[PDB]
Hints:
Strand content of chain A: under 5%
Family (chain B): Belongs to the FliD family.
Structural class of chain A: mainly alpha
Helix content of chain B: over 70%
Function (chain A): Flagellin is the subunit protein which polymerizes to form the filaments of bacterial flagella.
Number of helices of chain B: 3
Distance between the termini of chain B: 56 Å
Family (chain A): Belongs to the bacterial flagellin family.
Shape of chain A: rod-shaped
Strand content of chain B: under 5%
Order of helices and strands of chain B: HHH
Oligomer: part of a larger assembly
Shape of chain B: rod-shaped
Protein name (chain A): Flagellin
Distance between the termini of chain A: 71 Å
Structural class of chain B: mainly alpha
Subcellular location (chain A): Secreted; Bacterial flagellum
Number of helices of chain A: 1
Largest sheet of chain A: none
Helix content of chain A: over 70%
Radius of gyration of chain B: 18 Å
Amino acid sequence: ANRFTANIKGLTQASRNANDGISIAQTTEGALNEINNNLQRVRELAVQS
Amino acid sequence: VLKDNTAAARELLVGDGKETGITTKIATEVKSYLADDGIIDNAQDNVNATLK
Lengths: 49, 52
């Protein structure tokens, strides 16, 4: 029972760790969305040029 | 002006009709704007890509 309890708590913590990873990945993705939109505007300007 | 200097004013508005005439130039640049792959269509394509 001691061993099982330790594993249970560890896995529980790992759950929120994975959630944190999700959060950071999403934020990075949003930033990259902004970068991509700006680069699309650059493409517009190049097509003009 | 029409009564008196009609030919003169014609030379201004139209002129040769090839590289002269206010209407001539206006037609040239409006055609450039409206031409395929023109500025308008380029902007619209950009917007469509953003929608995608």
